[PDB]
Design a binder for this molecule. Structure first.
Ligand code: HEM
Ligand code: HEM
Ligand SMILES: N=C(Nc1cccc(O[C@H]2CN[C@H](COc3ccc(/N=C(/N)c4cccs4)cc3)C2)c1)c1cccs1
Ligand SMILES: N=C(Nc1cccc(O[C@H]2CN[C@H](COc3ccc(/N=C(/N)c4cccs4)cc3)C2)c1)c1cccs1
Ligand SMILES: C[C@H](O)[C@H](O)[C@H]1CNc2nc(N)[nH]c(=O)c2N1
Ligand SMILES: C[C@H](O)[C@H](O)[C@H]1CNc2nc(N)[nH]c(=O)c2N1
Ligand SMILES: [Zn+2]
Lengths: 405, 403
């Protein structure tokens, strides 16, 4: 019957039609001849005006005022401003709506049940690297909130014609050092090799531990970046122990409480906020499966299996699956004990199914990237595994952007 | 512009150029991706597919462009022009079946693709004859537990008449008996086929693991019922290497996975009954068949036996039971000496396959959501590997249920 993607849940037998994808203005990487959905990197003038008009229409709808005089004056305001300046500026309440809408729009986030609850710090008055540092520290203090984490975003000035960008160089506000060795290996987190070497080229005195917190490299328009060390008491970490395996604590493993992405671009109504770091809380599989067990990350699967006395010489003992489970349980248990917000992959995905049902009623669909939504252990044990998903790009949005160097 | 395909664990990059040869559209468009969807959203026609397939064949035997080739193309041409259809030589059929398996994007076992026993059953005129061919196939493929991949191919679709079909979705399937209180005894995926069997006269049982009969159908005839002789259906009792109470759950599974409702398309010709088999990957039995909520759904029972905290997701009880159940399956198949492959060995060998395919053909169509196992995804190398999905022919396809 309906001319929109049919979407099926194979566990419960239920069908829906996504009508929201109609609202996609921006193409993704797929064509009728080939599906490129599994690729991680999906490879103005009047152009700005129409993005702006579209965003202002979205704002007036969210407050139920489409067609009103407040609505048509705001449009006229926006084009007048572009008319003479080439760009325009967002009201405070517009920025707050657009930031939540960007989270809500993100196909790869499983945490969107929470989308309506986001503290938006407005930092569009910021004019130096020192000041960014102050805002960032404020963000971390508020978001961390002694372990009872609160979702938050801090928005720095938008991109502007000619003038250089605001940029945080690090990919997260909290990142462990990755030190390349003589023996070709790496101490710390291999993911952070490059940002580590940049920090050093820029005058940071490197440690040599597995869990050295990096300084921040902050860049204000048309200036070399500057280096700022986070005060250690601001950076809450959790030491990792296991509820029954007494030796697990002796491994000296740890992770930080606050995940906070700092290198993504927040785009709203054509405006481009190149520095707009955002934070929530972790799903446990991010730490316990990916960060600790990826072969190219900490890679601790073998060491843990040896302690558990598993047969690591044969795949069919499932030593990998057993070790990974215990690591995940340790992460959950240690966060619980420390009273630091965290969510397991079962709670997370159940809440995402609720989110999908909310959005079906509210917008008639929800863009979602199945390969990312499904957890990296125990996939089919979660209800998202059995749920078809339609992936597409809406604006406002979080986007990847080239690295500044 | 061709796709860049990156592996994120090793940082290596390929380009897929094989996809340029795709002639069929997939479910996606520029505006939206539909890859996680499970089901799909004249003479010159047949003639191009035929020419193209005959060209694939002669190329493969390196006898391309020449005499045997040009004459084979004329034969196909002469036959289509007069009859609106043609027929394949046995050795072409053999090439086509292997190539259809090779091209299947959802298949993690393709390293094996060159090793396929092909039974030509195109001289089949009755359900009875289909039954005999189906038994030889089971007997050959099972091989007392040393499983061997096989396909049996029945007579192709013809404009004039209905299809040869096997109603059952696999050759071995456990009964599912719906209760008046909604609930199911046996395998809830097989409720509708169980019911069809009874309607066509089968005496039901009441076990959790009662093996179904086959419903075989010769063209335009009511389907016919046939019982598989119990000694043809090899089964493995499930026990656990260290948990003695596990055996007592009375769980088992059959050795031979043989798909029997898909359509085999070669050279524009369609083979509506062409059952195929190989061997199981352990996660198919251990994770999906026994732990899916809408399958036998044994996760809670196992967790209670292991004495775990059921009250909370965050004890990871589900993850712990799943792992033991998969362990039980591998141990049990190893003990009965029946071919099985675990998901680590399987995905490791699929990686080697992508690499062979890259050198040979310049790409490999693969469906990431189906290749990555349903437990321990990121623990296998495939998780970390970008994959391009597209339809090449020869191919296995879905087709509608005959009832
Ligand atoms: C409330 C707690 C939250 C949880 C548990 C959560 C969970 C996640 C997870 C697990 C991922 C995938 C991570 C990975 O594999 O690298 C993700 C992606 C993402 N989330 Fe969240 N999220 C939360 C809140 C937030 C917030 C506050 C924002 C921004 C306002 C956000 C925006 C994103 C974006 C943009 C991505 C995808 C990044 C990319 O495409 O590469 N989420 N989320
Ligand atoms: C030799 C051992 C083999 C193994 C271990 C294997 C493994 C698998 C697995 C795990 C799947 C996913 C099935 C599911 O989740 O339901 C699959 C899909 C498939 N395999 Fe295999 N395979 C093997 C051999 C074969 C053979 C011999 C054929 C046919 C000649 C074949 C054709 C297929 C096809 C067509 C699919 C796709 C099914 C669909 O689209 O629904 N495979 N394979
Ligand atoms: N490689 C780099 N740049 C770069 C360029 C393009 C993309 C990119 O990756 C994104 C996707 N993946 C990465 C992280 O995204 C995440 C990470 C964690 C995450 N998890 C959470 N629970 C939350 C974070 C924030 C709110 S919830 C949610 C999203 C960030 C990194 C650099 C490394 C060092 C300096 S530049
Ligand atoms: N049944 C429905 N939808 C439907 C229709 C066609 C196909 C389908 O799913 C596929 C996926 N999967 C199924 C069989 O595929 C398999 C199964 C097992 C398998 N495993 C193996 N190891 C092998 C089998 C043979 C050689 S290796 C490899 C492939 C078949 C579902 C309907 C619901 C309501 C009205 S109609
Ligand atoms: C190749 C593949 O796209 C890549 O490994 C993806 C798979 N799914 C993922 N899912 C999440 N949430 N995060 C990731 O980094 C990835 N990696
Ligand atoms: C919606 C989703 O695509 C569906 O559940 C798929 C996911 N991946 C799968 N992968 C395999 N091998 N088998 C399956 O049945 C499925 N189910
Ligand atoms: Zn796609």
């Amino acid at each position: 019957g309906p001319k929109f993607p049919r979407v099926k849940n194979w566990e419960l037998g239920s069908i829906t039609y996504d009508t929201l994808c109609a609202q996609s203005q921006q193409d993704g990487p797929c064509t009728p001849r080939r599906c490129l959905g599994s690729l991680v990197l999906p490879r103005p003038a009047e152009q700005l005006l129409s993005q702006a008009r579209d965003f202002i229409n979205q704002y007036y709808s969210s407050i139920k005022r489409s067609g009103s005089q407040a609505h048509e004056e705001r449009l006229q305001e926006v084009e007048a401003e572009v008319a003479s300046t080439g760009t325009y500026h967002l009201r405070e309440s517009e920025l707050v709506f657009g930031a939540k809408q960007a989270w809500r729009n993100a196909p790869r986030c499983v945490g969107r049940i929470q989308w309506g609850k986001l503290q938006v710090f407005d930092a569009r008055d910021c004019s130096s690297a020192q000041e960014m540092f102050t805002y960032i520290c404020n963000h971390i203090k508020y978001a961390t909130n002694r372990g009872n984490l609160r979702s938050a975003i801090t928005v720095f000035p938008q991109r502007a014609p000619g003038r250089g960008d605001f940029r945080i160089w690090n990919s997260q506000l909290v990142r462990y050092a990755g030190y390349r060795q003589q023996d070709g290996s790496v101490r710390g987190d291999p993911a952070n090799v490059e940002i580590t070497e940049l920090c050093i080229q820029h005058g940071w005195t490197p440690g040599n531990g597995r869990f050295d917190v990096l300084p921040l490299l902050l860049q204000a328009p048309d200036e070399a970046p500057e280096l700022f060390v986070l005060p250690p008491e601001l950076v809450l970490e959790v030491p990792l122990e296991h509820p029954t395996l007494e030796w697990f604590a002796a491994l000296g493993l740890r992770w930080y409480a606050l995940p906070a992405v700092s290198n993504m671009l927040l785009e709203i109504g054509g405006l481009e906020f190149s520095a707009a770091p955002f934070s929530g809380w972790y799903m446990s599989t991010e730490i316990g499966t990916r960060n600790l067990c990826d072969p190219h990350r900490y890679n601790i699967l073998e060491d843990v299996a040896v302690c558990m006395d598993l047969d690591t010489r044969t795949t069919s003992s499932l030593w990998k699956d057993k070790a990974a489970v215990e690591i995940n349980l340790a992460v959950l248990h240690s966060f619980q004990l420390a009273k630091v917000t965290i969510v397991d992959h079962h709670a997370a995905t159940v809440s995402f199914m609720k989110h999908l049902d909310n959005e079906q009623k509210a917008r008639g669909g929800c863009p979602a990237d199945w390969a990312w939504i499904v957890p990296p252990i125990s996939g089919s044990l979660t209800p998202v595994f059995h749920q078809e998903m339609v992936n597409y790009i809406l604006s406002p949005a979080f986007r990847y952007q080239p690295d500044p160097w």
